[PDB]
Design an enzyme around this catalytic site. Structure first.
Site, PDB file in Angstrom:
ATOM      1  N   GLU A   1     -46.847 -10.971  19.070  1.00  0.00           N
ATOM      2  CA  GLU A   1     -46.670 -11.524  20.312  1.00  0.00           C
ATOM      3  C   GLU A   1     -47.281 -10.840  21.529  1.00  0.00           C
ATOM      4  OE1 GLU A   1     -42.108 -13.427  20.834  1.00  0.00           O
ATOM      5  OE2 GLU A   1     -41.955 -11.647  19.298  1.00  0.00           O
TER       6      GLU A   1
ATOM      7  N   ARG B   1     -34.786 -16.023  12.712  1.00  0.00           N
ATOM      8  CA  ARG B   1     -33.351 -16.701  12.767  1.00  0.00           C
ATOM      9  C   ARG B   1     -32.580 -16.025  11.277  1.00  0.00           C
ATOM     10  NH1 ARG B   1     -34.322 -22.801  12.638  1.00  0.00           N
ATOM     11  NH2 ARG B   1     -36.693 -22.371  12.185  1.00  0.00           N
TER      12      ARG B   1
ATOM     13  N   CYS C   1     -38.065 -20.577  15.800  1.00  0.00           N
ATOM     14  CA  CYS C   1     -37.750 -19.009  15.926  1.00  0.00           C
ATOM     15  C   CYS C   1     -37.897 -18.465  14.637  1.00  0.00           C
ATOM     16  CB  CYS C   1     -36.469 -18.774  16.406  1.00  0.00           C
ATOM     17  SG  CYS C   1     -35.974 -17.127  16.487  1.00  0.00           S
TER      18      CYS C   1
HETATM   19  C1  HEM Z   1     -34.133 -10.572  16.447  1.00  0.00           C
HETATM   20  C2  HEM Z   1     -35.555 -10.781  16.417  1.00  0.00           C
HETATM   21  C3  HEM Z   1     -36.111 -11.995  16.990  1.00  0.00           C
HETATM   22  C4  HEM Z   1     -37.422 -12.282  16.773  1.00  0.00           C
HETATM   23  C5  HEM Z   1     -38.176 -11.391  15.545  1.00  0.00           C
HETATM   24  C6  HEM Z   1     -37.893 -13.454  17.120  1.00  0.00           C
HETATM   25  C7  HEM Z   1     -38.975 -14.284  17.144  1.00  0.00           C
HETATM   26  C8  HEM Z   1     -39.354 -15.418  17.850  1.00  0.00           C
HETATM   27  C9  HEM Z   1     -40.873 -15.726  17.850  1.00  0.00           C
HETATM   28  C10 HEM Z   1     -41.948 -14.979  17.331  1.00  0.00           C
HETATM   29  C11 HEM Z   1     -40.623 -16.711  18.593  1.00  0.00           C
HETATM   30  C12 HEM Z   1     -42.428 -17.655  18.813  1.00  0.00           C
HETATM   31  C13 HEM Z   1     -42.182 -17.127  20.551  1.00  0.00           C
HETATM   32  C14 HEM Z   1     -43.568 -17.371  20.878  1.00  0.00           C
HETATM   33  O1  HEM Z   1     -44.469 -17.282  19.973  1.00  0.00           O
HETATM   34  O2  HEM Z   1     -43.316 -17.473  22.144  1.00  0.00           O
HETATM   35  C15 HEM Z   1     -39.482 -16.953  18.858  1.00  0.00           C
HETATM   36  C16 HEM Z   1     -38.998 -18.358  19.658  1.00  0.00           C
HETATM   37  C17 HEM Z   1     -37.562 -18.524  19.922  1.00  0.00           C
HETATM   38  N1  HEM Z   1     -36.556 -17.785  19.622  1.00  0.00           N
HETATM   39 FE1  HEM Z   1     -36.600 -16.150  18.392  1.00  0.00          FE
HETATM   40  N2  HEM Z   1     -36.813 -14.093  17.849  1.00  0.00           N
HETATM   41  C18 HEM Z   1     -35.849 -13.292  17.908  1.00  0.00           C
HETATM   42  C19 HEM Z   1     -34.406 -13.365  18.358  1.00  0.00           C
HETATM   43  C20 HEM Z   1     -33.911 -14.547  18.863  1.00  0.00           C
HETATM   44  C21 HEM Z   1     -32.679 -14.592  19.342  1.00  0.00           C
HETATM   45  C22 HEM Z   1     -31.414 -13.551  19.624  1.00  0.00           C
HETATM   46  C23 HEM Z   1     -32.630 -15.968  19.864  1.00  0.00           C
HETATM   47  C24 HEM Z   1     -31.629 -16.742  20.681  1.00  0.00           C
HETATM   48  C25 HEM Z   1     -30.313 -16.304  20.647  1.00  0.00           C
HETATM   49  C26 HEM Z   1     -33.924 -16.595  19.806  1.00  0.00           C
HETATM   50  C27 HEM Z   1     -34.173 -17.955  19.843  1.00  0.00           C
HETATM   51  C28 HEM Z   1     -35.442 -18.273  20.181  1.00  0.00           C
HETATM   52  C29 HEM Z   1     -35.825 -19.633  20.605  1.00  0.00           C
HETATM   53  C30 HEM Z   1     -34.904 -20.702  21.452  1.00  0.00           C
HETATM   54  C31 HEM Z   1     -37.217 -19.848  20.492  1.00  0.00           C
HETATM   55  C32 HEM Z   1     -38.222 -20.784  21.123  1.00  0.00           C
HETATM   56  C33 HEM Z   1     -38.626 -20.421  22.560  1.00  0.00           C
HETATM   57  C34 HEM Z   1     -39.703 -21.130  23.073  1.00  0.00           C
HETATM   58  O3  HEM Z   1     -39.673 -22.637  22.399  1.00  0.00           O
HETATM   59  O4  HEM Z   1     -40.246 -20.874  24.004  1.00  0.00           O
HETATM   60  N3  HEM Z   1     -34.772 -15.563  19.129  1.00  0.00           N
HETATM   61  N4  HEM Z   1     -38.766 -16.140  18.430  1.00  0.00           N
HETATM   62  C1  LIG Z   2     -35.372 -13.777  21.966  1.00  0.00           C
HETATM   63  C2  LIG Z   2     -36.911 -13.815  21.603  1.00  0.00           C
HETATM   64  C3  LIG Z   2     -37.548 -12.679  20.634  1.00  0.00           C
HETATM   65  C4  LIG Z   2     -38.608 -12.764  20.643  1.00  0.00           C
HETATM   66  N1  LIG Z   2     -39.443 -11.771  19.679  1.00  0.00           N
HETATM   67  N2  LIG Z   2     -39.701 -13.554  21.067  1.00  0.00           N
HETATM   68  C5  LIG Z   2     -39.051 -14.547  21.972  1.00  0.00           C
HETATM   69  C6  LIG Z   2     -40.149 -15.512  22.585  1.00  0.00           C
HETATM   70  C7  LIG Z   2     -40.566 -14.886  23.981  1.00  0.00           C
HETATM   71  C8  LIG Z   2     -41.320 -13.482  23.828  1.00  0.00           C
HETATM   72  N3  LIG Z   2     -42.548 -13.780  23.722  1.00  0.00           N
HETATM   73  C9  LIG Z   2     -43.062 -15.069  24.356  1.00  0.00           C
HETATM   74  C10 LIG Z   2     -41.851 -15.722  24.680  1.00  0.00           C
HETATM   75  N4  LIG Z   2     -41.732 -17.277  24.550  1.00  0.00           N
HETATM   76  C11 LIG Z   2     -40.721 -18.044  25.161  1.00  0.00           C
HETATM   77  C12 LIG Z   2     -41.609 -18.568  26.407  1.00  0.00           C
HETATM   78  N5  LIG Z   2     -42.526 -19.672  25.545  1.00  0.00           N
HETATM   79  C13 LIG Z   2     -43.311 -20.687  26.210  1.00  0.00           C
HETATM   80  C14 LIG Z   2     -43.144 -22.014  25.576  1.00  0.00           C
HETATM   81  C15 LIG Z   2     -43.650 -23.056  26.546  1.00  0.00           C
HETATM   82  C16 LIG Z   2     -44.484 -22.788  27.488  1.00  0.00           C
HETATM   83  C17 LIG Z   2     -45.203 -23.784  28.288  1.00  0.00           C
HETATM   84  C18 LIG Z   2     -44.455 -24.978  28.263  1.00  0.00           C
HETATM   85  C19 LIG Z   2     -43.372 -25.347  27.087  1.00  0.00           C
HETATM   86  F1  LIG Z   2     -43.113 -26.530  26.957  1.00  0.00           F
HETATM   87  C20 LIG Z   2     -43.023 -24.486  26.258  1.00  0.00           C
HETATM   88  C21 LIG Z   2     -38.028 -14.797  22.152  1.00  0.00           C
END
Ligand code: HEM
Ligand SMILES: Cc1cc(N)nc(C[C@H]2CNC[C@H]2NCCNCCc2cccc(F)c2)c1
Ligand code: HEM
Ligand SMILES: Cc1cc(N)nc(C[C@H]2CNC[C@H]2NCCNCCc2cccc(F)c2)c1
Ligand SMILES: C[C@H](O)[C@H](O)[C@H]1CNc2nc(N)[nH]c(=O)c2N1
Ligand SMILES: C[C@H](O)[C@H](O)[C@H]1CNc2nc(N)[nH]c(=O)c2N1
Ligand SMILES: [Zn+2]
Lengths: 410, 407
Positions: free
Chosen positions: B283, B109, B106
């Site tokens: 995204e 954070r 993320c």
């Molecule tokens: C507040 C603005 C936030 C931004 C700008 C943000 C941004 C991002 C971005 C760009 C990614 C990459 C996701 C992707 O490319 O699919 C990501 C992944 C992630 N975010 Fe953040 N996020 C935000 C809020 C949060 C919050 C509130 C949480 C949890 C409470 C969180 C937890 C996570 C987690 C666990 C991932 C990994 C998801 C995965 O592995 O598929 N984010 N975030």
């Molecule tokens: C909370 C929050 C904020 C933000 N800006 N963005 C996010 C990630 C979300 C939104 N935009 C993409 C999505 N990402 C969460 C799903 N990601 C797929 C990861 C994946 C797929 C297949 C196999 C795997 F092992 C793992 C979360």
């Protein structure tokens, strides 16, 4: 043990068995991944095993594993090590070794080309003047008037580590960097320190934005010596843009030939500390990194200014916009002057085909994603979507400390 | 055993000590890096509980106090007889924030401590879940001034009574395979869309149909619900310079709300824990719009810009890509829906790393995920070495429940 890698755009799943041949260590542990860290005298004891592994590979590739010529060569290498403490590679084995080091290079996207590599054997070289001559010849052959050809020149191997051949330049052709008293830099900021060393050694510096550095060459553990590459050997491309007429007036140019000279080539346990190699550029190396890195030429501001983009907020993506136009110009310029270059789409697409071929016929392709994905437009290139396994095969190219840090001055 | 991390653009070196607290495994070995792979009892619970409780009491600066010990006993009393235990509100809020703090993928954070936690542990039914979810969606949306939130349903028990949100995000668009062979809407959601059809959903069969919620309570069969349309804030996509851009018919929703992950706190497992923030522009503009296996609009967009598509080397894909992303940011900005561009987000993440190294001794970060999918090297995170490791509390992936759930 079989490991799977998946491409998430095509669902193509591949199986790696090659990683089982990996000996060297990655930097990673079960508890920590060092995947984004840039950098995470041998005994007779350890040398024969390394020779044996290598020669086993070599003789297996030529379909002669366990042949008389294979057994005899092992025998001959064993005896040579015992008697002399090192050994000499045959020409065939050197060429094979050098190609495999390339084939094994995880961070290289250009590896589809690995088997087409011209090897120059410089193991009879004894002096810095001899090195300069070898290097000029490589530059001329590799350049080939714009129709670039891959090449490597291999100087004598390490003996006691007190008699190393080294090319002190990081690349055979690079631009000087000059730190001014006001704290600004003129030319390439990455080369300030090495430029300072060159000046110290007696280089008369033109003090321009694109002064081709001199070669600083160390033969046989001796103090290194300065030489100027003949300028008619240095192919350069002035950069202009196909639609933007003002682009030329930025005064940008680049040299056609990328030629890494500071790495160490390991083959069968032997260490070639001087082994410059060259191919051709991927456009982004110049247009993204060399021009647009903040610590490099840093031209983004000037280009966006001339494009009259909105620069008062990052969210206009003025940086991204300028970045694309600069990269368009780089490719247009090289193509127009018929200097070999490859764009990042084409280069990454060919890498995926290579990688799949390597799995099918070798059981794997070590690949470092951090380095393979280009530094612009990452996810619109197919490598972004490609799972990769990074591991270390020999033969290999390794980094080595900069010689000015270790060299003992006479 | 103490590790240095370097930024190659600023020569700033930070020392990481936090990694020595990591427990879970990376998938890497000394022989092999798996950094680019997407997915690499009573006796068991109490270590995990203690480990967590210890850090909690140290954080409120009351480590080794009697209240710390007292809590340690009571948890242990409860595991010995109920074979599980319940978190206090304080511990729950802390655990949730820290699972975000620990999410190495993320970029966002810097915000970790401003998270609204909704305790939905009193929920018993899918209708209950639905109500909690609508309230989350509305609170987080906040008419466009988006606020970070998480809603936490009851924890796993014997794993036969799981709460699950079947959707991958609370708000997504449906996907339909056509007689044509082509795909209408979001190809990522084809399978899930079919599962909704299979249970009675009437599909508008458009490019942009908001999926229904498929909510499972107590391991019961999941149920369909339509988020009130007036709670789903969407943005039409237009360009500040290209008047024709509107004719592509593009829109996106404002609320990214990940709903398929598992929240682990002190060994307890929260299988339904939807959370939301706000989008980084790439995204949508890069991944959702331009991935070949997604909406894949680069061809159409380039055709409208009348760029030379005869060869890759004109960089027509790259040109169009900037424009599409300029359009996403402009559209969210003009409608006052919170969005962050990738320059601003990565800059803020560097500042956050520096804070975390200073005040916590480190920050786990996954470079492969942190570096945006466009203009990588012109964002400062590209030049930043990062150490990846798994800390707890934690968000984890879990297998899609349809493969698991028995009907
Ligand atoms: C507040 C603005 C936030 C931004 C700008 C943000 C941004 C991002 C971005 C760009 C990614 C990459 C996701 C992707 O490319 O699919 C990501 C992944 C992630 N975010 Fe953040 N996020 C935000 C809020 C949060 C919050 C509130 C949480 C949890 C409470 C969180 C937890 C996570 C987690 C666990 C991932 C990994 C998801 C995965 O592995 O598929 N984010 N975030
Ligand atoms: C909370 C929050 C904020 C933000 N800006 N963005 C996010 C990630 C979300 C939104 N935009 C993409 C999505 N990402 C969460 C799903 N990601 C797929 C990861 C994946 C797929 C297949 C196999 C795997 F092992 C793992 C979360
Ligand atoms: C033929 C055209 C070639 C292309 C387009 C190419 C492309 C690239 C690129 C883009 C990189 C990343 C460099 C960076 O971003 O700094 C790279 C790295 C590398 N390449 Fe190639 N290469 C080519 C030929 C060769 C040859 C002939 C060799 C050696 C025989 C080679 C060996 C390597 C090695 C060892 C690295 C890693 C360098 C480092 O870690 O600093 N490449 N290559
Ligand atoms: C042979 C060849 C062909 C090609 N297209 N491209 C190349 C890489 C060259 C050219 N363009 C960039 C340069 N890169 C080679 C040197 N890279 C520095 C790596 C480094 C820095 C600091 C600490 C480290 F541990 C490692 C080689
Ligand atoms: C910190 C990070 O590992 C470092 O900046 C790497 C990232 N990827 C790279 N990739 C290439 N091709 N060249 C580089 O110099 C780098 N730099
Ligand atoms: C194969 C590779 O790991 C995969 O494409 C990853 C790369 N980096 C990513 N980074 C982000 N932020 N999101 C992603 O979905 C991915 N996909
Ligand atoms: Zn790793």
């Amino acid at each position: 043990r079989f490991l799977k890698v998946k491409n998430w755009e095509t669902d193509v799943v591949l199986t790696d068995t090659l990683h089982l041949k990996s000996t060297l260590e990655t930097g990673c542990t079960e508890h920590i991944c060092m995947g984004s860290i840039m950098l995470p005298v041998r005994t007779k004891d350890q040398l024969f095993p390394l020779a044996k592994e290598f020669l086993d590979q070599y003789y297996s590739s030529i379909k002669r594993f366990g042949s008389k010529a294979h057994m005899d060569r092992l025998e001959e290498v064993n005896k040579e090590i015992e008697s002399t403490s090192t050994y000499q590679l045959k020409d065939t084995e050197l060429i094979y070794g050098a190609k495999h080091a390339w084939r094994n290079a995880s961070r290289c996207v250009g590896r589809i080309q690995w088997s087409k590599l011209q090897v120059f054997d410089a193991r009879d070289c004894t002096t810095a003047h001899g090195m300069f001559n070898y290097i000029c010849n490589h530059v001329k052959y590799a350049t080939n008037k714009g129709n670039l050809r891959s090449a490597i020149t291999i100087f004598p191997q390490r003996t006691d580590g007190k008699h190393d051949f080294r090319v002190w330049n990081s690349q055979l052709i690079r631009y000087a960097g000059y730190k001014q008293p006001d704290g600004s830099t003129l030319g390439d900021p990455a080369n300030v320190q090495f430029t300072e060393i060159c000046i110290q050694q007696g280089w008369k510096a033109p003090r321009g934005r694109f002064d081709v550095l001199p070669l600083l060459l160390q033969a046989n553990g001796n103090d290194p010596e300065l030489f100027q590459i003949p300028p008619e050997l240095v192919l350069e491309v002035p950069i202009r843009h196909p639609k933007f007429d003002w682009f030329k007036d930025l005064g940008l140019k680049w040299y056609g030939l990328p030629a890494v000279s500071n790495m160490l080539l390991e083959i069968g346990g032997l260490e070639f500390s001087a082994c410059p190699f060259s191919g051709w550029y991927m456009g982004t190396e110049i247009g993204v990194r060399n021009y647009c890195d903040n610590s490099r030429y840093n031209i983004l501001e000037e280009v966006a200014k001339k494009m009259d983009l909105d620069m008062r907020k990052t969210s206009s993506l003025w940086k991204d916009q300028a970045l694309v136009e600069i990269n368009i110009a780089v490719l247009y310029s090289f193509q127009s002057d018929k200097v070999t270059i490859v764009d990042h789409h084409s280069a990454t697409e060919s890498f995926i085909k290579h990688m799949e071929n390597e799995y099918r016929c070798r059981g794997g392709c070590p690949a470092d994603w951090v380095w393979i994905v280009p530094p612009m437009s990452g996810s619109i290139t197919p490598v972004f979507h490609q799972e990769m396994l990074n591991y270390r095969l020999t033969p290999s190219f390794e980094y080595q400390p900069d010689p000015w840090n270790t060299h003992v001055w006479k």
